[PDB]
Amino acid sequence: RAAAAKDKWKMKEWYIVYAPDFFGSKEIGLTPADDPEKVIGRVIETTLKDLTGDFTKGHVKLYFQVYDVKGQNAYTKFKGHTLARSYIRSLVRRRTTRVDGIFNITTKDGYKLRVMGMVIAYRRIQTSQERAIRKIIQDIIYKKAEELNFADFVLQSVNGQIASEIAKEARKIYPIKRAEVRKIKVLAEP
Amino acid sequence: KEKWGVAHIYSSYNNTIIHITDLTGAETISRWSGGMVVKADRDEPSPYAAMIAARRAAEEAMEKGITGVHIKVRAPGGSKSKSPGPGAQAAIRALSRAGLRIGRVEDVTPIPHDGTRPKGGRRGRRV
RNA sequence: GGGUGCGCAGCGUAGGCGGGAGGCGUCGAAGCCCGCCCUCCGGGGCGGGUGGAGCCGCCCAUGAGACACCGCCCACCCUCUG
RNA sequence: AGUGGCGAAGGCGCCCGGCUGGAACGGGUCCGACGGUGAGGGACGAAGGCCAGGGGAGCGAACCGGAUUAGAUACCCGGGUAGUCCUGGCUGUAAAGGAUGCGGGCUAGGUGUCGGGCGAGCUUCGAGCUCGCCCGGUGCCGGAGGGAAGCCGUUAAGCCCGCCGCC
């Protein structure tokens, strides 16, 4: 019947989701649930402009996971981020070269991450140059990891500083268009 | 207050499914298929059938209190086809007209970096 | 205990008994303003508020008549105790 | 991701590290004809199949069901066993095809691309861009010339010097 259905829908309460502290604690959205603990473990997908409205960084997607509740207010943690399909496809064209590196990182605070960085060149280049560029990416990311910690790592990786450094130092082997950091996953926590 | 949901569309050469959830995708609100609104199996993916199911789902969502909606459109993918059917755009326009506000739109057709073997038989279908 | 009733034709959810032509309005109401719950969202039952003095029915239908007022049941899904 | 590259051929595409084979370029470096082909003999050799041991997601011979059909031991649909995968061995086959045996000298060139080297100009000073030349690989056009023709044409299916296999 529809009686129990309406009963179920009307027994459901709403909760307000909140971003973490090294971001700005915002009001991403709302979640229904009957009980409080059916909400522990839930992934909100948003973009970076919604948080801080820079009109250009609309292609970045962040994923926040629910881990705690206090009344009708839930608080999140950072889980990972990835670029957008449309952006990546518009980038990777024919008669160019794509160079991707995937590395495992441990920050100053003991967080373990998997970072996937990407580079694009203007022409159909050799393979030794690919490998040199990959080594550059690796060195820079390891250095930034040993010198920085989670919050700054993520904020820089999403704002586009590490990408600028990567591009500037890889411009010594072959010029470059649209260097970027494409993905981060969190694997562990102390 | 303004609440947003998410519309997953599964489109094929044989049916169309519209499914509206909250932003988390863990709480379901409405679910309607092309096979609930016709009696011919050869009409389930007709964009009119898609329009109708979209309208039903949107009105139920509005009744429940949903105002905005993001959109993820999908084809089966994997080893099957990677191209959606013709009911997806119909459903999107119908959701727009029903009275909901629309946000982001994305395609989520799962694609194989390299994967399993499809069903043809090294010669495909021969009819 | 809190809530909960379109067999038809219907001013409309007449549910059924005994009494009840009589019941109320400062033991303050309408008409007008915004709101949670029940449910065939039918439609009422419910609350703070401009409001300051009318409205039900014996008057017709329906087999059993009034949400006319007093005591009691019942169909559900719910809140406390022992 | 290429009309591209390496490999005797079969064949070889995620990343980092180690061991290993061969070719080109550059070279007033070393030996000093040590070379070519190769009967008989040997080594490699897709898929499928066999032996022995493990594993088993998807696909799927055989098999079983539903339809289509005059019938349908098939095409279409739903399921499914060996097999496809790893270790250690056998079998020795294909449109294994450039359907074109290997080496050497000669008989117009043009235009692309891959690697290396040289010389000029640009530069954001980049293992970077452009233009030209020599060597080697790999393609598309084409004149004499050749051929039954289709077509080949300095990567000959042309004229010469050789060896083996075959009709």
Coordinates of C-alpha atoms (C1' of nucleotides) in Angstrom, one line a residue:
Chain A
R1 CA 0.0 0.0 0.0
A2 CA 0.9 3.7 0.0
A3 CA 0.1 4.2 3.7
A4 CA 3.4 2.6 5.0
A5 CA 5.2 4.4 2.1
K6 CA 4.0 7.8 3.3
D7 CA 4.8 6.8 6.9
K8 CA 8.3 6.0 5.8
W9 CA 8.8 9.2 3.9
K10 CA 7.4 11.2 6.8
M11 CA 9.5 9.5 9.4
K12 CA 12.6 10.7 7.6
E13 CA 14.4 13.7 9.0
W14 CA 16.9 16.1 7.2
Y15 CA 20.5 16.8 8.0
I16 CA 22.8 19.6 6.9
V17 CA 26.2 18.6 5.5
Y18 CA 29.3 20.6 6.4
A19 CA 32.7 20.8 4.7
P20 CA 36.0 20.4 6.7
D21 CA 38.1 23.0 8.5
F22 CA 41.0 23.6 6.2
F23 CA 38.4 24.5 3.6
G24 CA 35.7 26.9 4.7
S25 CA 33.0 25.1 6.6
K26 CA 30.0 25.5 4.2
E27 CA 26.5 24.1 3.7
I28 CA 27.0 21.9 0.7
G29 CA 23.6 20.3 1.0
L30 CA 21.0 18.2 2.8
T31 CA 20.5 14.5 3.4
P32 CA 17.4 12.6 4.5
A33 CA 17.5 9.7 6.9
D34 CA 15.5 7.9 9.5
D35 CA 18.4 7.2 11.9
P36 CA 21.6 9.1 12.6
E37 CA 24.0 6.3 11.9
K38 CA 22.6 5.4 8.5
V39 CA 24.3 8.7 7.5
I40 CA 27.8 7.7 8.6
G41 CA 29.5 7.0 5.3
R42 CA 28.1 9.1 2.5
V43 CA 29.9 10.9 -0.3
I44 CA 28.9 14.4 -1.4
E45 CA 30.3 15.4 -4.8
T46 CA 30.7 19.1 -5.5
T47 CA 33.0 21.5 -7.4
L48 CA 35.5 24.0 -6.2
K49 CA 33.7 27.1 -7.6
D50 CA 30.6 26.3 -5.5
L51 CA 32.9 26.6 -2.5
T52 CA 35.0 29.5 -3.7
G53 CA 33.5 31.0 -6.8
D54 CA 36.4 31.4 -9.1
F55 CA 34.7 31.0 -12.5
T56 CA 37.5 29.1 -14.1
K57 CA 37.9 26.2 -11.7
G58 CA 34.6 24.6 -12.5
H59 CA 36.1 21.4 -13.9
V60 CA 37.5 20.3 -10.5
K61 CA 35.3 17.8 -8.6
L62 CA 35.8 17.2 -4.9
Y63 CA 34.4 14.3 -2.9
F64 CA 33.6 14.7 0.8
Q65 CA 32.8 11.8 3.1
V66 CA 30.6 11.9 6.2
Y67 CA 32.2 10.7 9.4
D68 CA 30.3 12.2 12.4
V69 CA 27.0 13.7 13.4
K70 CA 25.9 16.2 16.1
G71 CA 22.2 16.7 16.3
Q72 CA 21.0 17.5 12.8
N73 CA 24.5 18.7 11.6
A74 CA 27.0 16.4 9.9
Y75 CA 30.7 17.0 9.3
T76 CA 32.9 15.8 6.5
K77 CA 36.4 14.7 5.7
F78 CA 38.4 14.9 2.4
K79 CA 38.6 11.7 0.4
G80 CA 39.9 12.6 -3.0
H81 CA 39.4 14.6 -6.2
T82 CA 39.5 14.1 -10.0
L83 CA 39.4 16.3 -13.0
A84 CA 36.4 16.2 -15.5
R85 CA 35.9 13.9 -18.4
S86 CA 35.0 16.7 -20.9
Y87 CA 38.2 18.6 -19.9
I88 CA 40.5 15.6 -20.3
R89 CA 38.9 14.6 -23.7
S90 CA 39.2 18.2 -25.0
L91 CA 42.9 18.1 -24.0
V92 CA 44.0 14.8 -25.4
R93 CA 44.0 15.3 -29.2
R94 CA 45.8 13.7 -32.1
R95 CA 49.4 14.6 -33.1
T96 CA 50.4 15.4 -29.5
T97 CA 51.9 13.5 -26.6
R98 CA 50.4 12.6 -23.2
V99 CA 52.5 11.7 -20.2
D100 CA 50.9 10.4 -17.0
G101 CA 52.5 9.5 -13.7
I102 CA 51.0 7.7 -10.8
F103 CA 52.9 7.9 -7.5
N104 CA 52.4 6.9 -3.8
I105 CA 53.1 9.7 -1.2
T106 CA 53.4 10.0 2.5
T107 CA 53.1 13.6 3.9
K108 CA 54.6 15.1 7.0
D109 CA 51.6 14.1 9.1
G110 CA 51.6 10.4 8.1
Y111 CA 48.7 10.6 5.5
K112 CA 49.1 8.2 2.6
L113 CA 48.0 9.4 -0.9
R114 CA 48.0 8.3 -4.5
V115 CA 48.6 11.2 -6.8
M116 CA 48.1 11.0 -10.6
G117 CA 49.7 13.9 -12.5
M118 CA 49.4 14.6 -16.2
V119 CA 51.3 16.5 -18.8
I120 CA 50.7 17.3 -22.5
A121 CA 53.2 18.3 -25.2
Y122 CA 52.7 20.1 -28.5
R123 CA 54.1 17.4 -30.8
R124 CA 54.7 13.7 -31.3
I125 CA 57.8 13.4 -29.1
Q126 CA 60.1 10.5 -28.3
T127 CA 60.0 8.2 -25.3
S128 CA 63.2 9.2 -23.6
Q129 CA 61.7 12.7 -23.3
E130 CA 58.5 11.1 -21.8
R131 CA 60.7 9.4 -19.2
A132 CA 62.6 12.5 -18.4
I133 CA 59.4 14.5 -17.9
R134 CA 58.0 11.7 -15.7
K135 CA 61.1 11.8 -13.5
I136 CA 60.7 15.5 -13.1
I137 CA 57.1 15.1 -12.0
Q138 CA 58.2 12.4 -9.5
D139 CA 60.9 14.5 -8.0
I140 CA 58.8 17.6 -7.6
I141 CA 55.9 15.7 -6.0
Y142 CA 58.2 13.9 -3.6
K143 CA 59.8 17.2 -2.5
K144 CA 56.4 18.9 -2.0
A145 CA 55.2 15.9 0.0
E146 CA 58.2 15.9 2.3
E147 CA 58.0 19.7 2.9
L148 CA 54.2 20.1 3.2
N149 CA 51.2 18.4 4.9
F150 CA 47.7 17.4 3.9
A151 CA 45.9 20.7 3.9
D152 CA 48.4 22.7 2.0
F153 CA 49.2 19.8 -0.4
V154 CA 45.5 19.5 -1.4
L155 CA 45.0 23.3 -1.6
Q156 CA 48.0 23.8 -3.8
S157 CA 47.3 20.7 -6.0
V158 CA 43.8 22.0 -6.6
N159 CA 44.6 25.7 -7.0
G160 CA 47.4 25.0 -9.6
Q161 CA 50.8 25.9 -8.1
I162 CA 52.4 22.4 -8.3
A163 CA 51.2 22.4 -11.9
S164 CA 53.0 25.6 -12.7
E165 CA 56.2 24.4 -11.2
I166 CA 55.9 21.1 -13.1
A167 CA 55.3 23.0 -16.4
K168 CA 58.2 25.4 -15.8
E169 CA 60.7 22.7 -15.1
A170 CA 59.5 20.3 -17.8
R171 CA 59.7 23.2 -20.3
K172 CA 63.5 22.4 -20.4
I173 CA 63.0 19.1 -22.3
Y174 CA 60.1 20.1 -24.5
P175 CA 57.5 22.9 -24.4
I176 CA 54.1 22.2 -22.8
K177 CA 50.5 23.0 -22.8
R178 CA 48.0 22.4 -19.9
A179 CA 50.1 20.7 -17.3
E180 CA 47.9 19.7 -14.3
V181 CA 47.4 17.3 -11.4
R182 CA 44.6 15.1 -12.4
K183 CA 43.7 12.9 -9.4
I184 CA 44.2 12.3 -5.7
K185 CA 43.0 9.4 -3.6
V186 CA 43.4 9.2 0.2
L187 CA 44.5 5.6 1.2
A188 CA 45.1 5.7 4.9
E189 CA 45.3 7.8 8.1
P190 CA 47.5 7.5 11.2
Chain B
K1 CA 14.6 26.2 1.5
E2 CA 15.9 25.0 -1.8
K3 CA 16.9 21.3 -2.0
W4 CA 18.8 19.6 -4.9
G5 CA 18.6 16.0 -6.1
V6 CA 20.3 13.9 -8.8
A7 CA 18.7 12.3 -11.8
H8 CA 20.4 9.2 -13.1
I9 CA 19.3 8.2 -16.6
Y10 CA 20.0 4.8 -18.0
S11 CA 19.3 4.8 -21.7
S12 CA 19.6 1.9 -24.1
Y13 CA 18.3 0.7 -27.5
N14 CA 15.6 -1.2 -25.6
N15 CA 14.5 0.9 -22.6
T16 CA 15.0 4.0 -20.5
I17 CA 15.1 4.4 -16.7
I18 CA 14.9 7.7 -14.8
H19 CA 15.8 7.6 -11.2
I20 CA 15.9 10.6 -8.8
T21 CA 17.9 10.5 -5.6
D22 CA 19.3 12.9 -3.1
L23 CA 22.8 14.4 -3.6
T24 CA 24.3 11.4 -1.9
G25 CA 22.5 8.7 -4.0
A26 CA 21.8 6.7 -0.9
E27 CA 18.2 7.8 -0.4
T28 CA 15.7 7.1 -3.3
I29 CA 12.8 9.3 -4.1
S30 CA 11.3 8.2 -7.5
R31 CA 11.9 5.5 -10.1
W32 CA 10.1 5.1 -13.4
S33 CA 10.7 3.0 -16.5
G34 CA 9.5 3.1 -20.1
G35 CA 7.8 -0.2 -19.4
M36 CA 5.4 1.2 -16.9
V37 CA 3.8 3.7 -19.3
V38 CA 3.2 1.6 -22.5
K39 CA 2.2 -1.9 -23.5
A40 CA 4.3 -2.5 -26.6
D41 CA 7.8 -3.7 -25.9
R42 CA 8.9 -2.0 -29.1
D43 CA 8.0 1.5 -27.7
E44 CA 9.8 1.5 -24.3
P45 CA 12.6 3.7 -25.7
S46 CA 10.4 6.1 -27.6
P47 CA 11.2 9.6 -26.6
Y48 CA 7.6 10.1 -25.8
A49 CA 7.6 7.3 -23.3
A50 CA 10.7 8.8 -21.9
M51 CA 9.0 12.2 -21.6
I52 CA 6.1 10.6 -19.8
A53 CA 8.2 8.7 -17.3
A54 CA 10.3 11.9 -16.7
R55 CA 7.1 13.8 -16.0
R56 CA 5.8 11.3 -13.5
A57 CA 9.2 11.2 -11.7
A58 CA 9.5 14.9 -11.6
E59 CA 6.0 15.5 -10.2
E60 CA 6.6 12.9 -7.5
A61 CA 9.9 14.5 -6.6
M62 CA 8.3 18.0 -6.4
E63 CA 5.6 16.5 -4.2
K64 CA 8.3 15.2 -1.9
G65 CA 9.9 18.7 -1.9
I66 CA 12.7 18.6 -4.5
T67 CA 13.5 21.8 -6.4
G68 CA 16.8 21.6 -8.1
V69 CA 18.5 18.6 -9.8
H70 CA 21.8 17.6 -11.2
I71 CA 22.0 15.1 -14.1
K72 CA 24.0 12.0 -14.9
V73 CA 23.2 10.3 -18.2
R74 CA 24.5 6.8 -18.9
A75 CA 24.6 4.1 -21.5
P76 CA 25.2 0.5 -20.4
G77 CA 28.9 0.6 -21.5
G78 CA 31.6 -1.9 -20.6
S79 CA 31.5 -4.5 -23.3
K80 CA 28.1 -3.3 -24.6
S81 CA 27.4 -0.1 -26.5
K82 CA 29.0 3.2 -25.5
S83 CA 26.4 5.4 -27.2
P84 CA 23.2 6.4 -25.5
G85 CA 19.7 5.9 -27.0
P86 CA 17.3 8.6 -28.2
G87 CA 15.2 9.0 -25.0
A88 CA 17.8 10.7 -22.9
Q89 CA 17.4 14.2 -24.4
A90 CA 13.6 13.8 -24.3
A91 CA 13.8 13.0 -20.6
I92 CA 16.0 16.0 -19.9
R93 CA 13.8 18.4 -21.7
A94 CA 10.8 16.9 -19.9
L95 CA 12.4 17.3 -16.5
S96 CA 13.2 20.9 -17.4
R97 CA 9.6 21.6 -18.4
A98 CA 8.1 19.9 -15.4
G99 CA 9.3 22.8 -13.2
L100 CA 12.6 21.7 -11.7
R101 CA 15.7 23.7 -11.9
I102 CA 18.7 22.1 -13.6
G103 CA 22.3 22.3 -12.6
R104 CA 25.3 20.3 -13.8
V105 CA 25.0 17.6 -16.6
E106 CA 27.5 14.8 -17.0
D107 CA 28.0 11.5 -18.9
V108 CA 29.0 8.5 -16.8
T109 CA 29.1 5.7 -19.4
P110 CA 31.7 3.4 -17.9
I111 CA 34.5 2.9 -20.4
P112 CA 37.3 -0.3 -20.2
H113 CA 41.0 0.9 -20.1
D114 CA 41.3 -2.6 -21.6
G115 CA 38.7 -5.3 -20.6
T116 CA 36.6 -8.3 -21.3
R117 CA 35.5 -10.0 -24.5
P118 CA 32.2 -9.1 -26.1
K119 CA 29.5 -11.5 -27.3
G120 CA 29.8 -11.4 -31.1
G121 CA 31.8 -14.5 -31.8
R122 CA 34.7 -13.2 -34.0
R123 CA 32.2 -12.6 -36.8
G124 CA 29.6 -10.6 -35.0
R125 CA 25.9 -11.0 -35.6
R126 CA 24.9 -12.1 -39.1
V127 CA 21.1 -11.7 -38.8
Chain C
rG1 C1' -4.2 7.8 25.7
rG2 C1' -3.3 11.4 20.7
rG3 C1' -4.7 10.9 16.3
rU4 C1' -8.0 7.9 12.8
rG5 C1' -14.9 7.0 9.1
rC6 C1' -16.8 9.8 0.5
rG7 C1' -22.4 1.7 0.7
rC8 C1' -25.4 5.4 -3.2
rA9 C1' -28.0 10.0 -4.6
rG10 C1' -24.4 14.4 -1.2
rC11 C1' -25.4 21.3 1.3
rG12 C1' -21.0 15.7 2.7
rU13 C1' -16.7 11.2 5.7
rA14 C1' -25.5 10.7 7.5
rG15 C1' -20.5 4.7 10.7
rG16 C1' -24.0 2.2 14.6
rC17 C1' -26.9 2.2 19.4
rG18 C1' -30.3 4.5 24.2
rG19 C1' -31.4 9.4 25.5
rG20 C1' -30.8 14.3 22.9
rA21 C1' -35.4 19.4 20.2
rG22 C1' -33.0 21.3 21.7
rG23 C1' -27.1 23.0 21.5
rC24 C1' -24.0 26.9 22.2
rG25 C1' -21.5 32.9 21.6
rU26 C1' -16.7 36.6 27.8
rC27 C1' -17.2 28.3 30.9
rG28 C1' -15.7 35.1 24.5
rA29 C1' -18.0 32.5 16.9
rA30 C1' -17.6 33.6 12.6
rG31 C1' -16.0 35.8 8.2
rC32 C1' -10.2 37.2 7.3
rC33 C1' -3.4 35.3 8.2
rC34 C1' -0.1 32.8 8.0
rG35 C1' 1.5 26.5 9.6
rC36 C1' 3.1 20.3 11.6
rC37 C1' 0.6 15.5 11.8
rC38 C1' -3.8 11.4 10.0
rU39 C1' -5.3 9.8 6.0
rC40 C1' -9.3 7.4 -0.6
rC41 C1' -3.2 15.2 -0.3
rG42 C1' -10.7 12.8 -0.5
rG43 C1' -11.0 16.6 2.9
rG44 C1' -11.7 17.6 7.2
rG45 C1' -9.4 16.9 12.6
rC46 C1' -5.2 20.5 14.8
rG47 C1' -2.3 25.3 16.6
rG48 C1' -0.6 31.2 17.8
rG49 C1' -3.1 35.3 15.5
rU50 C1' -7.1 41.6 12.4
rG51 C1' -11.4 39.9 14.1
rG52 C1' -16.0 41.0 18.2
rA53 C1' -21.7 38.3 17.9
rG54 C1' -23.6 34.1 14.6
rC55 C1' -24.3 29.4 13.5
rC56 C1' -26.2 23.8 13.7
rG57 C1' -30.9 21.4 13.3
rC58 C1' -37.2 19.5 14.1
rC59 C1' -37.3 22.4 8.3
rC60 C1' -36.3 17.8 2.5
rA61 C1' -33.9 13.3 0.7
rU62 C1' -31.7 7.9 3.2
rG63 C1' -33.6 1.8 5.3
rA64 C1' -31.6 3.0 9.5
rG65 C1' -29.9 11.6 10.3
rA66 C1' -27.1 14.9 11.3
rC67 C1' -20.0 16.4 12.5
rA68 C1' -28.2 18.7 16.6
rC69 C1' -25.6 17.4 22.1
rC70 C1' -24.6 13.6 25.8
rG71 C1' -22.2 7.8 27.5
rC72 C1' -19.9 3.3 24.4
rC73 C1' -17.7 0.4 20.2
rC74 C1' -15.2 -0.5 16.2
rA75 C1' -10.0 -0.4 10.9
rC76 C1' -5.3 1.0 11.1
rC77 C1' -0.3 2.7 11.9
rC78 C1' 1.7 5.4 16.8
rU79 C1' 3.3 8.0 22.4
rC80 C1' 4.2 6.4 28.7
rU81 C1' 4.4 3.5 32.3
rG82 C1' 3.9 -1.6 35.2
Chain D
rA1 C1' 48.7 5.3 -31.7
rG2 C1' 50.8 7.0 -36.9
rU3 C1' 50.5 5.8 -43.7
rG4 C1' 54.9 4.9 -37.5
rG5 C1' 59.1 1.4 -34.7
rC6 C1' 62.2 -3.3 -33.2
rG7 C1' 62.7 -8.4 -34.7
rA8 C1' 65.3 -14.2 -39.2
rA9 C1' 60.6 -15.3 -39.5
rG10 C1' 56.4 -16.5 -36.0
rG11 C1' 55.4 -12.1 -33.6
rC12 C1' 56.1 -7.7 -29.8
rG13 C1' 51.9 -2.0 -26.8
rC14 C1' 50.6 0.4 -18.3
rC15 C1' 54.9 2.2 -15.1
rC16 C1' 59.8 1.9 -12.3
rG17 C1' 64.4 -1.2 -11.4
rG18 C1' 68.0 -5.2 -12.9
rC19 C1' 70.3 -8.9 -16.6
rU20 C1' 70.7 -9.6 -22.0
rG21 C1' 70.7 -9.9 -28.1
rG22 C1' 71.2 -7.2 -32.6
rA23 C1' 71.3 -3.0 -36.2
rA24 C1' 72.4 2.3 -38.1
rC25 C1' 75.4 6.9 -37.8
rG26 C1' 80.4 9.1 -36.7
rG27 C1' 85.7 7.3 -37.1
rG28 C1' 93.8 9.0 -41.2
rU29 C1' 91.3 3.0 -34.8
rC30 C1' 92.7 -2.8 -35.3
rC31 C1' 93.2 -7.7 -38.3
rG32 C1' 94.4 -8.4 -43.5
rA33 C1' 90.3 -11.9 -48.5
rC34 C1' 89.2 -14.2 -43.1
rG35 C1' 84.0 -14.1 -48.5
rG36 C1' 78.8 -16.1 -51.4
rU37 C1' 75.3 -20.2 -51.6
rG38 C1' 74.4 -24.3 -49.2
rA39 C1' 72.7 -31.3 -50.9
rG40 C1' 72.5 -34.4 -46.2
rG41 C1' 72.1 -32.5 -40.8
rG42 C1' 70.3 -28.9 -37.0
rA43 C1' 67.7 -24.6 -34.1
rC44 C1' 63.3 -21.4 -33.8
rG45 C1' 58.3 -21.7 -35.3
rA46 C1' 50.3 -18.5 -34.8
rA47 C1' 45.9 -21.0 -33.5
rG48 C1' 44.1 -25.5 -32.3
rG49 C1' 45.2 -30.4 -30.1
rC50 C1' 47.7 -34.0 -26.4
rC51 C1' 50.5 -35.5 -21.3
rA52 C1' 51.3 -34.1 -16.1
rG53 C1' 50.2 -30.7 -12.3
rG54 C1' 47.3 -25.8 -10.6
rG55 C1' 43.5 -22.1 -11.6
rG56 C1' 38.9 -20.8 -13.5
rA57 C1' 36.0 -13.7 -13.9
rG58 C1' 34.2 -13.0 -19.1
rC59 C1' 33.7 -15.5 -23.8
rG60 C1' 32.3 -20.0 -25.4
rA61 C1' 33.1 -25.9 -29.8
rA62 C1' 30.0 -30.0 -28.1
rC63 C1' 25.1 -30.2 -25.5
rC64 C1' 20.4 -28.5 -23.9
rG65 C1' 16.0 -25.1 -24.5
rG66 C1' 12.9 -20.9 -27.2
rA67 C1' 11.6 -19.0 -32.0
rU68 C1' 11.8 -18.8 -37.8
rU69 C1' 10.7 -22.2 -41.5
rA70 C1' 7.3 -26.7 -46.2
rG71 C1' 11.3 -28.7 -43.0
rA72 C1' 15.9 -26.1 -40.1
rU73 C1' 20.5 -31.3 -37.4
rA74 C1' 21.6 -23.5 -39.2
rC75 C1' 21.6 -18.2 -39.3
rC76 C1' 18.6 -14.9 -34.3
rC77 C1' 17.6 -15.3 -28.5
rG78 C1' 18.5 -17.4 -23.4
rG79 C1' 22.0 -20.9 -20.8
rG80 C1' 26.6 -24.1 -20.9
rU81 C1' 31.3 -28.3 -20.9
rA82 C1' 36.2 -28.8 -22.7
rG83 C1' 39.3 -24.7 -24.0
rU84 C1' 41.2 -19.8 -23.7
rC85 C1' 45.5 -18.3 -18.2
rC86 C1' 50.4 -20.0 -15.2
rU87 C1' 54.6 -24.2 -14.6
rG88 C1' 57.2 -28.3 -17.2
rG89 C1' 57.2 -31.1 -21.9
rC90 C1' 55.2 -33.3 -26.9
rU91 C1' 52.9 -32.2 -31.9
rG92 C1' 55.7 -29.2 -36.3
rU93 C1' 51.3 -27.3 -39.2
rA94 C1' 48.4 -22.1 -42.1
rA95 C1' 45.9 -17.4 -47.9
rA96 C1' 53.0 -19.3 -42.4
rG97 C1' 51.3 -14.3 -48.8
rG98 C1' 55.2 -9.0 -50.9
rA99 C1' 51.1 -15.5 -53.3
rU100 C1' 57.7 -12.2 -55.5
rG101 C1' 65.0 -17.4 -52.8
rC102 C1' 70.0 -15.1 -51.1
rG103 C1' 74.5 -12.1 -52.3
rG104 C1' 77.2 -8.3 -55.9
rG105 C1' 77.9 -4.2 -59.9
rC106 C1' 75.0 -1.1 -63.5
rU107 C1' 70.5 1.7 -66.2
rA108 C1' 66.3 9.7 -65.0
rG109 C1' 64.2 11.7 -61.0
rG110 C1' 60.3 13.9 -57.8
rU111 C1' 57.8 14.3 -53.1
rG112 C1' 56.7 12.5 -47.8
rU113 C1' 58.2 10.0 -43.1
rC114 C1' 61.8 7.5 -39.3
rG115 C1' 67.0 7.5 -37.1
rG116 C1' 72.0 9.5 -37.0
rG117 C1' 75.5 13.4 -38.6
rC118 C1' 77.0 18.4 -40.9
rG119 C1' 75.9 23.6 -42.2
rA120 C1' 72.9 28.0 -42.0
rG121 C1' 69.0 31.0 -39.8
rC122 C1' 65.0 31.8 -35.4
rU123 C1' 64.4 31.6 -30.3
rU124 C1' 60.4 31.9 -24.9
rC125 C1' 67.5 29.9 -24.7
rG126 C1' 64.2 24.1 -24.3
rA127 C1' 67.0 16.8 -25.4
rG128 C1' 63.3 23.4 -28.8
rC129 C1' 61.4 25.4 -34.4
rU130 C1' 62.4 26.0 -39.8
rC131 C1' 65.5 25.3 -44.4
rG132 C1' 69.2 22.6 -47.1
rC133 C1' 73.0 18.4 -47.7
rC134 C1' 75.4 12.8 -46.8
rC135 C1' 74.5 7.9 -45.1
rG136 C1' 70.8 4.1 -43.9
rG137 C1' 65.5 2.2 -43.4
rU138 C1' 60.3 2.5 -44.9
rG139 C1' 56.1 4.5 -48.4
rC140 C1' 53.4 7.2 -52.8
rC141 C1' 54.0 9.0 -58.0
rG142 C1' 56.5 8.6 -62.4
rG143 C1' 59.9 9.0 -67.8
rA144 C1' 62.9 5.6 -70.8
rG145 C1' 62.6 0.3 -70.5
rG146 C1' 59.9 -4.5 -69.6
rG147 C1' 55.6 -7.6 -69.9
rA148 C1' 49.8 -11.9 -72.4
rA149 C1' 47.9 -8.1 -70.0
rG150 C1' 46.6 -6.4 -64.9
rC151 C1' 50.8 -3.9 -63.8
rC152 C1' 56.3 -3.6 -62.2
rG153 C1' 59.4 0.6 -62.8
rU154 C1' 67.4 2.3 -58.6
rU155 C1' 62.9 -1.4 -52.2
rA156 C1' 62.4 -4.1 -60.7
rA157 C1' 58.6 -8.4 -62.5
rG158 C1' 65.3 -4.5 -66.7
rC159 C1' 70.8 -5.8 -68.7
rC160 C1' 75.1 -8.7 -66.4
rC161 C1' 78.4 -12.2 -62.8
rG162 C1' 77.1 -16.6 -59.3
rC163 C1' 75.0 -20.9 -56.0
rC164 C1' 70.5 -23.9 -53.9
rG165 C1' 65.2 -25.5 -54.1
rC166 C1' 61.2 -26.5 -57.4
rC167 C1' 57.7 -27.3 -62.3

